[PDB]
Amino acid sequence: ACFRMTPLYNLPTHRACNMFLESYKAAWILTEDHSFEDRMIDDLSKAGEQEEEEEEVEEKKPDPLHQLVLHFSRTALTEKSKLDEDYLYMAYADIMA
Amino acid sequence: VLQMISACKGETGAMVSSTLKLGISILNGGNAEVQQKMLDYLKDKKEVGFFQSIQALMQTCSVLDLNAFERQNKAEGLGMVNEDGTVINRQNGEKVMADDEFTQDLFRFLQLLCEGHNNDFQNYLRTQTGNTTTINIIICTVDYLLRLQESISDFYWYYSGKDVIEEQGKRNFSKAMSVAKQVFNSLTEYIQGP
Amino acid sequence: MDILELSERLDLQRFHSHTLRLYRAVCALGNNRVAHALCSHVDQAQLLHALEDAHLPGPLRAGYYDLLISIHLESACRSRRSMLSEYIVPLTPETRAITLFPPGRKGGNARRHGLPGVGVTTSLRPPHHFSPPCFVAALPAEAPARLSPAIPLEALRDKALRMLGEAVRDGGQHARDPVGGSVEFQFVPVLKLVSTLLVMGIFGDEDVKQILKMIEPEVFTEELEEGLLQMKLPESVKLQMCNLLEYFCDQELQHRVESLAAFAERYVDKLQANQRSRYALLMRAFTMSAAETARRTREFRSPPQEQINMLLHFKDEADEEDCPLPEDIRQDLQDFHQDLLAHCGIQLEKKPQSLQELVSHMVVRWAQEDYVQSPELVRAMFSLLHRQYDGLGELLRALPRAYTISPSSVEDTMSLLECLGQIRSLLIVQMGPQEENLMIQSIGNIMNNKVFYQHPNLMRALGMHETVMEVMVNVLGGGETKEIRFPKMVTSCCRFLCYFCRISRQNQRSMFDHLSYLLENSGIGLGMQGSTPLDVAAASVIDNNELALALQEQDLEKVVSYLAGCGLQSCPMLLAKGYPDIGWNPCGGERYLDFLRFAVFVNGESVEENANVVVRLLIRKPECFGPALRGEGGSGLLAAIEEAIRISEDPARDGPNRVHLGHAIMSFYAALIDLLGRCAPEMHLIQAGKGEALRIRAILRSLVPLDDLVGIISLPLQIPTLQPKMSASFVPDHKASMVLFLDRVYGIENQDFLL
Amino acid sequence: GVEIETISPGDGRTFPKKGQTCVVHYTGMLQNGKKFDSSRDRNKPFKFRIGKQEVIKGFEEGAAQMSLGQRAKLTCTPDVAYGATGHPGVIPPNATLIFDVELLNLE
Amino acid sequence: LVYYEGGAVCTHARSLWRLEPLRISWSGSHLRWGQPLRIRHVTTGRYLALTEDQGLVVVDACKAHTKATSFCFRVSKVEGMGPPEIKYGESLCFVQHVASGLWLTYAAPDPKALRLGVLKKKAILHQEGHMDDALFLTRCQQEESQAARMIHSTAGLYNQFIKGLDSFSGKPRGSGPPAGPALPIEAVILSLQDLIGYFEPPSEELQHEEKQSKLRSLRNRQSLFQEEGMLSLVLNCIDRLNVYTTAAHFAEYAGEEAAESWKEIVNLLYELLASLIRGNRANCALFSTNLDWVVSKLDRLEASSGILEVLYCVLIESPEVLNIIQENHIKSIISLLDKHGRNHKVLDVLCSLCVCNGVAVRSNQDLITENLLPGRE
């Protein structure tokens, strides 16, 4: 087969575009944004309890991260047979690591 | 993380893989304080719920199979489809192990639990007081480092009559031996700190 | 009595409150038949009159908004929402001009993101269809139970926005008696209507530029009325705000992929033109140096996709460059890729002045000033800021659903896209005899559209093979064989799956992965014709030559266990016709074994690894063999078939399948030896230079004596004369299964060929 | 049998013929007094073609006997309009239908 | 008869056994090798014995005169607490009859049909036995053990009530002498009032963790009361009681002193059955065959709260029973609204006939539109 493999210059324009996008997964998959990792837990969680709070008695209002984890604990305790996918859990599990 | 693993009984899907990856990051080094919190909860909830998962999960781990190796050795003979972007899978490594990126972390998680010569996990893993039943992870891990040993020795006979090991005969081989080293590290950390 | 006084009864209101809940419940997940019958019952006018009304008991008329949204909409919203994930785009002149706000001047290149959602999208979406109610029309006896109810969309759009204009002004003014009773009744039912009308895109250009003005200070003023995101709100309307903000994220995403398509057009055009210039420079003209011909190899060799990799690698790479292009077309990427990695999230080292800053700075405030209950809420906003903090992550997870096509074919695809929607609505509804009819024409019209033959990559991106798969599993889900309700549709659909599997190699792989799933619910419902899920299971690997190597044993092991069943059962469904059913059923066995034939060889007597384990596994269960032979009583090598011959011309014995029973017995044993003639060790390439394959050859040769086998090729029934025979008895056409059984097992040698 | 009782007078010379459209701003009722249809709550007049069997038999034999601008009251017997099974959800089976038809324009 | 079973009955009350030593004092002391003892089945309330020829038969508590039972433990083939020897899960004790000196093992005579059919084996006291007994013990002493004696007590108190009730099935009273043996009424009323409290659903103000924990401890016990009957039993009582129609006046020929205590007994069963069905899913599937029976009545002047609630809880969990209504059950419940007034509870039930969890059915989502909707009364 290797001699009849048509040249590139005879392909229809519509088809010669889909191959470009699928092949051009060589500028995102290798580039790194970093960014959301260290600035995430910095602005979120820490410094969450700002001067907005006016008074307290015995306890303290949970900071924004504290709501997040307990939610995963909340859904974990739900009486079910098998855990679902919940890709949202994957998105935050990795960035916490 | 203990609550998340307990919910997933014995299915090694993407759930626990992304969860066990987290647990390594909290308790790297020694981290004595985080170990104390985990022990207190297990003594408080006093349900089994979790050691069933660990015992069942590691029994589903794979070893160095040989029959699957032959399936690669002829599938790799082909180089490209008639005309479709050549072999898209290329490496398609999922066969011999397809788990080393995961099964190497399960044992590391256990080893890091008994770090710093902590003499409560090193005793708790042997027998769970109270509760209803015990699991004894200690004897439950040595059995794995016997089936794997029977696999490498096996692999040796397949190459006993040859003279040079081809490139794909070493890439898979080094994968298995790296796993065996990680298991050996754990066994020491149940004994260190007598 | 007047409706307005039901606010002071508290018992008659409670009954009527549930009444309008029944009407919401009667209009099930698409029931255009009975939906219109409610129109004569409830109204067409006082619903439109309930909007402006202010005196409101609460759980009453405020609940009518949930009935207006149920008898006129979600007949397309429930479908158009599924349409929002794939981003098919055609080659159009309008598409040729799309960028990051190109009326920007200097600063506008790195700023002026543009208001989210203006127009020009060129995406392919089916249009809404509506019909007016008329109960004086002639008695019908086409459209599925009917098309849809109608309504003046023009009046609703203007009225809704004007109504919400009062809400923002009234909320700031404050009062001790809000519309409906307590603030949230004045907000949640009215802006929920706004959200549903927004996804259909009834609003256009000017209209959406005003809904953004409800959060004026930041988003508006591209060139008093405090924004909706300024005041404290209860824990219910905040959820709806998330449902509104969520619609705007993908609008930017839909704008994002179109920009790539715009760049995916002009840059590929010059690339093809410049590559031809590269040809004639090194074409027949050529020069010298010999080895230069070795260097120019991508240009004629390698598949076209391989060429793209070589020519695109160095463009967006760093430092090292190999086989480069002219340093004139390699500059726009370093600008476009720079331009792209300045819009989404990249810093590339007050007033938000951007949606990204607005959402991120706002969601944090909501958590810092409240402990949010209702877990359904907290899951909402946490899915937002993750998207606004990982821009490329969403993009990277969106391209595998994007596809470009050419004009003069959009009309053909438009019919396919609209027709495919009805299948998606079929999954949610339970199977009905009227609905069963609908799909058969639906799938029948799918396989004529001229587009499900040219672009298979679409159909795996839309993935209708996924959706149609659940259609089969629901109907077949049952305790035993008695649950064969709704036949004639599994056959009508399984035929479509087989042809899908015979269009491309990647199509074969994509459905192959469900082989274990398919066989789990395949060997139960046996007895019909045309097709069965077992057939498409067999067709999943017929000529791959590498899929056969990618089996997992357990699949082959479990199908064998099925064959153990048909060696001791009696076929009670076959028995139900009042048939002998002596010891076992050959009908079932002939189907399982036909599958195994396609997993022992792929192309001309090859692949033995799976073949080797088949014989070593099949021997373990001796009951797999028909009890006529390979047993303890007797074997009857030339007698078992002869016994079948005796029953062949015995109409009394038979069953007093659809033809006779002796043919079924002949079909079994002939097919079994056909399996163990191609499950032979190998050709003499291995049998003459090794000692492993000889072990298998000894085994199979020891189970079929040659003395009986040679004699079996004899006694043909008759020939038509004077009046042909019938295909109900033991024929002779299917006796060639014993020819290949001796051609590659014992083989010719001495001079026995004469005998 | 269609009983046409007049309500308001009309022109008296222009009557509908075959193949011709009519606009009719009707409102239908039952014998008990319960309204089941109206074409004035929608503010969209009903338009139909005479002779092509769009409307029921009682409606067109009712609209053919009137003049332009005339408003009459029909009493359609259940034999000529939805006899046995009826229209499910709107009209009960074996029910008498009353129509207050008014022809606005074009015969 | 005694059998063996895998990981199916291991979470069931059938496989629970109680050990009763022969002494009266220090019976709770540590158990040691070489000590005679008896074996009792908890829910059956019977011992195990081999009398003369019938085999290892589960004998009652009246023919167990310390010679037929006579069991003890052997390693291989005291006025105090005593020495603790036998452990949990690894003691590997061997069972042996004392008088006969035999060893217990499985006969396991399996034909072709038995091998592929019932996975059940029979145990016999063979003279030499097999080599694979290794009977080790597991401890289950928790809330479920308390809810084991309850089955025997309630099931032994119910059937005696029906059996006594069944005697006067068709005999009009010879006014004066009411009947023969009397009937218990105060006992059952207290008994039923306990289980409804015992099966009372989890509260609302409790937090998630405590609510979820008890939610697991309620579903199990609801299923545990089905495998030992007690669904047929409560069904059986309704069949016998519901024969007496009208009021206590027709029930007069059963003892007029118990007539005035008729309404509450009829009532109390119904919400008891609702407790056994509400929430749980497996039990709801049982009513598919009995759907016609429950929907039948819907008319007794003292059943209104009971029947509308039991029907409400079986159409909220199982969509299977939802598919077994043809044309007449719908108009029956429709007529209920026509005879018992304007009740929002019934209208809510009709919403259940509509879309189920996710999936919607159209075979019946038109009948209500054509039956309760066209008429405007």
PDB file of N, CA, C and O in Angstrom, chain C residues 14-15 18-19 21-22 25-26 28-31 34 38 41 428-430, chain E residues 342-344 347 350-351 354-355 359-362 365-366 368-369 373 376:
ATOM      1  N   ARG C  14     -55.716  24.411  49.021  1.00  0.00           N
ATOM      2  CA  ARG C  14     -54.837  23.249  49.089  1.00  0.00           C
ATOM      3  C   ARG C  14     -55.256  22.181  48.087  1.00  0.00           C
ATOM      4  O   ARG C  14     -54.411  21.560  47.436  1.00  0.00           O
ATOM      5  N   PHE C  15     -56.564  21.950  47.957  1.00  0.00           N
ATOM      6  CA  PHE C  15     -57.050  21.014  46.947  1.00  0.00           C
ATOM      7  C   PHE C  15     -56.737  21.499  45.539  1.00  0.00           C
ATOM      8  O   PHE C  15     -56.285  20.718  44.693  1.00  0.00           O
ATOM      9  N   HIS C  18     -52.936  21.170  44.407  1.00  0.00           N
ATOM     10  CA  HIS C  18     -52.555  19.869  43.868  1.00  0.00           C
ATOM     11  C   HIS C  18     -53.180  19.616  42.503  1.00  0.00           C
ATOM     12  O   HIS C  18     -52.639  18.833  41.712  1.00  0.00           O
ATOM     13  N   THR C  19     -54.324  20.243  42.209  1.00  0.00           N
ATOM     14  CA  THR C  19     -54.979  20.008  40.926  1.00  0.00           C
ATOM     15  C   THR C  19     -54.093  20.438  39.766  1.00  0.00           C
ATOM     16  O   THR C  19     -53.890  19.678  38.813  1.00  0.00           O
ATOM     17  N   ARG C  21     -51.025  20.605  39.876  1.00  0.00           N
ATOM     18  CA  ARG C  21     -49.881  19.700  39.856  1.00  0.00           C
ATOM     19  C   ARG C  21     -50.176  18.453  39.032  1.00  0.00           C
ATOM     20  O   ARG C  21     -49.274  17.916  38.380  1.00  0.00           O
ATOM     21  N   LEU C  22     -51.423  17.978  39.049  1.00  0.00           N
ATOM     22  CA  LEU C  22     -51.791  16.850  38.198  1.00  0.00           C
ATOM     23  C   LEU C  22     -51.617  17.195  36.727  1.00  0.00           C
ATOM     24  O   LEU C  22     -51.100  16.385  35.951  1.00  0.00           O
ATOM     25  N   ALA C  25     -48.332  16.895  35.798  1.00  0.00           N
ATOM     26  CA  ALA C  25     -47.972  15.484  35.793  1.00  0.00           C
ATOM     27  C   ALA C  25     -48.588  14.739  34.620  1.00  0.00           C
ATOM     28  O   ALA C  25     -47.983  13.797  34.100  1.00  0.00           O
ATOM     29  N   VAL C  26     -49.792  15.133  34.203  1.00  0.00           N
ATOM     30  CA  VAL C  26     -50.397  14.521  33.025  1.00  0.00           C
ATOM     31  C   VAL C  26     -49.574  14.815  31.782  1.00  0.00           C
ATOM     32  O   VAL C  26     -49.367  13.929  30.944  1.00  0.00           O
ATOM     33  N   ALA C  28     -46.671  14.436  30.520  1.00  0.00           N
ATOM     34  CA  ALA C  28     -45.485  13.667  30.868  1.00  0.00           C
ATOM     35  C   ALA C  28     -44.318  14.145  30.010  1.00  0.00           C
ATOM     36  O   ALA C  28     -44.370  15.190  29.360  1.00  0.00           O
ATOM     37  N   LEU C  29     -43.234  13.378  30.014  1.00  0.00           N
ATOM     38  CA  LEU C  29     -42.034  13.794  29.301  1.00  0.00           C
ATOM     39  C   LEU C  29     -42.280  13.746  27.795  1.00  0.00           C
ATOM     40  O   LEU C  29     -41.653  12.962  27.077  1.00  0.00           O
ATOM     41  N   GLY C  30     -43.201  14.585  27.323  1.00  0.00           N
ATOM     42  CA  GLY C  30     -43.562  14.683  25.924  1.00  0.00           C
ATOM     43  C   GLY C  30     -44.820  13.893  25.628  1.00  0.00           C
ATOM     44  O   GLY C  30     -44.752  12.682  25.411  1.00  0.00           O
ATOM     45  N   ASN C  31     -45.974  14.555  25.622  1.00  0.00           N
ATOM     46  CA  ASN C  31     -47.253  13.876  25.428  1.00  0.00           C
ATOM     47  C   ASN C  31     -48.192  14.736  24.586  1.00  0.00           C
ATOM     48  O   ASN C  31     -49.357  14.942  24.934  1.00  0.00           O
ATOM     49  N   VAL C  34     -52.232  14.377  24.605  1.00  0.00           N
ATOM     50  CA  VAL C  34     -53.122  14.853  25.660  1.00  0.00           C
ATOM     51  C   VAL C  34     -52.798  16.264  26.117  1.00  0.00           C
ATOM     52  O   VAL C  34     -53.575  16.846  26.882  1.00  0.00           O
ATOM     53  N   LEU C  38     -55.751  19.685  27.368  1.00  0.00           N
ATOM     54  CA  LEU C  38     -55.746  20.575  28.520  1.00  0.00           C
ATOM     55  C   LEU C  38     -55.964  22.027  28.105  1.00  0.00           C
ATOM     56  O   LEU C  38     -56.458  22.829  28.905  1.00  0.00           O
ATOM     57  N   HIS C  41     -59.271  22.996  28.479  1.00  0.00           N
ATOM     58  CA  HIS C  41     -59.684  22.912  29.874  1.00  0.00           C
ATOM     59  C   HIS C  41     -59.197  24.108  30.679  1.00  0.00           C
ATOM     60  O   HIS C  41     -59.993  24.799  31.319  1.00  0.00           O
ATOM     61  N   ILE C 428     -36.269   8.086  27.305  1.00  0.00           N
ATOM     62  CA  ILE C 428     -36.854   8.473  28.585  1.00  0.00           C
ATOM     63  C   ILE C 428     -38.235   7.850  28.761  1.00  0.00           C
ATOM     64  O   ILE C 428     -38.579   7.365  29.845  1.00  0.00           O
ATOM     65  N   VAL C 429     -39.044   7.852  27.701  1.00  0.00           N
ATOM     66  CA  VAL C 429     -40.387   7.293  27.784  1.00  0.00           C
ATOM     67  C   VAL C 429     -40.316   5.772  27.796  1.00  0.00           C
ATOM     68  O   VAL C 429     -39.471   5.161  27.127  1.00  0.00           O
ATOM     69  N   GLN C 430     -41.186   5.153  28.586  1.00  0.00           N
ATOM     70  CA  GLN C 430     -41.307   3.703  28.581  1.00  0.00           C
ATOM     71  C   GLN C 430     -41.858   3.229  27.241  1.00  0.00           C
ATOM     72  O   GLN C 430     -42.596   3.947  26.560  1.00  0.00           O
TER      73      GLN C 430
ATOM     74  N   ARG E 342     -63.720  15.648  48.723  1.00  0.00           N
ATOM     75  CA  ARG E 342     -62.554  16.273  48.115  1.00  0.00           C
ATOM     76  C   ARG E 342     -61.364  16.059  49.047  1.00  0.00           C
ATOM     77  O   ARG E 342     -61.241  16.733  50.073  1.00  0.00           O
ATOM     78  N   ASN E 343     -60.493  15.122  48.682  1.00  0.00           N
ATOM     79  CA  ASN E 343     -59.351  14.742  49.501  1.00  0.00           C
ATOM     80  C   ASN E 343     -58.095  14.894  48.662  1.00  0.00           C
ATOM     81  O   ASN E 343     -57.959  14.236  47.625  1.00  0.00           O
ATOM     82  N   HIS E 344     -57.182  15.761  49.104  1.00  0.00           N
ATOM     83  CA  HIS E 344     -55.950  15.977  48.356  1.00  0.00           C
ATOM     84  C   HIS E 344     -55.058  14.746  48.341  1.00  0.00           C
ATOM     85  O   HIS E 344     -54.177  14.647  47.482  1.00  0.00           O
ATOM     86  N   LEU E 347     -55.732  12.726  45.087  1.00  0.00           N
ATOM     87  CA  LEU E 347     -55.200  13.431  43.927  1.00  0.00           C
ATOM     88  C   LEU E 347     -53.683  13.301  43.859  1.00  0.00           C
ATOM     89  O   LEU E 347     -53.103  13.230  42.768  1.00  0.00           O
ATOM     90  N   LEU E 350     -52.827   9.855  42.313  1.00  0.00           N
ATOM     91  CA  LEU E 350     -52.917   9.826  40.857  1.00  0.00           C
ATOM     92  C   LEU E 350     -51.662  10.389  40.203  1.00  0.00           C
ATOM     93  O   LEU E 350     -51.292   9.965  39.105  1.00  0.00           O
ATOM     94  N   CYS E 351     -50.992  11.340  40.861  1.00  0.00           N
ATOM     95  CA  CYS E 351     -49.719  11.830  40.345  1.00  0.00           C
ATOM     96  C   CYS E 351     -48.662  10.736  40.341  1.00  0.00           C
ATOM     97  O   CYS E 351     -47.706  10.802  39.560  1.00  0.00           O
ATOM     98  N   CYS E 354     -48.453   8.720  37.207  1.00  0.00           N
ATOM     99  CA  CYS E 354     -47.744   9.454  36.172  1.00  0.00           C
ATOM    100  C   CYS E 354     -46.274   9.063  36.194  1.00  0.00           C
ATOM    101  O   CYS E 354     -45.924   8.002  36.720  1.00  0.00           O
ATOM    102  N   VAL E 355     -45.423   9.893  35.590  1.00  0.00           N
ATOM    103  CA  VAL E 355     -43.993   9.627  35.466  1.00  0.00           C
ATOM    104  C   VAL E 355     -43.412   9.066  36.760  1.00  0.00           C
ATOM    105  O   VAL E 355     -43.673   9.576  37.855  1.00  0.00           O
ATOM    106  N   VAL E 359     -38.289   7.656  34.318  1.00  0.00           N
ATOM    107  CA  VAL E 359     -39.026   7.069  33.208  1.00  0.00           C
ATOM    108  C   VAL E 359     -40.503   7.404  33.352  1.00  0.00           C
ATOM    109  O   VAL E 359     -41.038   7.515  34.460  1.00  0.00           O
ATOM    110  N   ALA E 360     -41.165   7.577  32.209  1.00  0.00           N
ATOM    111  CA  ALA E 360     -42.591   7.854  32.151  1.00  0.00           C
ATOM    112  C   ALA E 360     -43.266   6.803  31.288  1.00  0.00           C
ATOM    113  O   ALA E 360     -42.681   6.296  30.331  1.00  0.00           O
ATOM    114  N   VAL E 361     -44.509   6.490  31.629  1.00  0.00           N
ATOM    115  CA  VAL E 361     -45.289   5.477  30.930  1.00  0.00           C
ATOM    116  C   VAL E 361     -46.522   6.136  30.323  1.00  0.00           C
ATOM    117  O   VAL E 361     -47.169   6.975  30.961  1.00  0.00           O
ATOM    118  N   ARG E 362     -46.821   5.774  29.076  1.00  0.00           N
ATOM    119  CA  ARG E 362     -47.928   6.367  28.338  1.00  0.00           C
ATOM    120  C   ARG E 362     -49.136   5.458  28.206  1.00  0.00           C
ATOM    121  O   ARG E 362     -50.208   5.937  27.821  1.00  0.00           O
ATOM    122  N   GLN E 365     -51.079   6.993  30.960  1.00  0.00           N
ATOM    123  CA  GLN E 365     -51.151   8.449  31.013  1.00  0.00           C
ATOM    124  C   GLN E 365     -52.041   9.005  29.900  1.00  0.00           C
ATOM    125  O   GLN E 365     -51.709   9.974  29.216  1.00  0.00           O
ATOM    126  N   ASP E 366     -53.188   8.365  29.690  1.00  0.00           N
ATOM    127  CA  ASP E 366     -54.329   8.962  29.006  1.00  0.00           C
ATOM    128  C   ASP E 366     -55.662   8.576  29.620  1.00  0.00           C
ATOM    129  O   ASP E 366     -56.645   9.298  29.418  1.00  0.00           O
ATOM    130  N   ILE E 368     -56.782   8.527  32.750  1.00  0.00           N
ATOM    131  CA  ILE E 368     -57.275   9.543  33.673  1.00  0.00           C
ATOM    132  C   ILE E 368     -57.732  10.777  32.908  1.00  0.00           C
ATOM    133  O   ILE E 368     -58.671  11.465  33.326  1.00  0.00           O
ATOM    134  N   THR E 369     -57.089  11.078  31.776  1.00  0.00           N
ATOM    135  CA  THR E 369     -57.503  12.223  30.977  1.00  0.00           C
ATOM    136  C   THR E 369     -58.868  11.998  30.339  1.00  0.00           C
ATOM    137  O   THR E 369     -59.605  12.960  30.110  1.00  0.00           O
ATOM    138  N   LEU E 373     -61.691  13.937  33.962  1.00  0.00           N
ATOM    139  CA  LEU E 373     -61.283  15.154  33.265  1.00  0.00           C
ATOM    140  C   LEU E 373     -62.362  15.607  32.280  1.00  0.00           C
ATOM    141  O   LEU E 373     -62.749  16.781  32.321  1.00  0.00           O
ATOM    142  N   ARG E 376     -67.271  17.413  33.836  1.00  0.00           N
ATOM    143  CA  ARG E 376     -66.942  18.683  34.471  1.00  0.00           C
ATOM    144  C   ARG E 376     -67.742  18.885  35.752  1.00  0.00           C
ATOM    145  O   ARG E 376     -68.246  19.975  36.028  1.00  0.00           O
TER     146      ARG E 376
END
